[PDB]
Each structure stands twice: as C-alpha cells, then as structure tokens.
Amino acid sequence: VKKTSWTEEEDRIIYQAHKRLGNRWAEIAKLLPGRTDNAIKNHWNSTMRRKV
C-alpha cells in the first residue's frame, strides 16, 4: 500500500486547500509542515490528476 510516499490523509489537506486556493502550492506548501512546492506540485500533477 504505502511506506515512503504521500499518505491519503495528508492528501486531504492538499485537496481542501487546493479546492480553495487552486494550484497555489506556494501557500499550500507553507501551510504544510515538512512539505515543499516542488514535492506537492509533482505529486498532485501525477497522482491527483484523474480525480474524477
């Protein structure tokens, strides 16, 4: 399932924030603790793509 990757629970935060701010990883990354723009950006634009 998972071991060294983005957790579904963490994704909850990215989704909630992204739904309001959009692709504003600049802020979502700052709001998150040990996360970065690049990390969230590439993660979302790969995993969180075919959401629907």
Q: Which domains does the chain have, with CATH numbers?
A: 1-52 (1.10.10.60)
Distance set, CA 3 to CA 7, 8, 19, 46 (Å): 9, 12, 27, 18
Residues 6 or more apart in contact with residue 43 via CB below 8 angstroms: 6, 14
Which tokens in the block code for residue 52?
Answer: 């629907």
Q: What value does the CA radius of gyration of the chain take, rounded to a whole number of Å? A: 10
Neighbours of 25 (CB within 10 A): 24
Instruction: Tabulate helix, strand, coil % of the chain (nearest 5).
Output: 55, 0, 45
Cα-Cα-Cα-Cα dihedral sign, residues 5, 10, 12, 16: negative
Give yes or no for a contact between 13 and 21, defined as CB atoms under 8 angstroms apart.
Answer: no
Q: Which residues lie below 8 Å from residue 51, measured CB to CB, with a gap of 6+?
A: none
Method by which this entry was solved? NMR
CA triplet 21, 41, 37: central angle to 5 degrees? Answer: 80
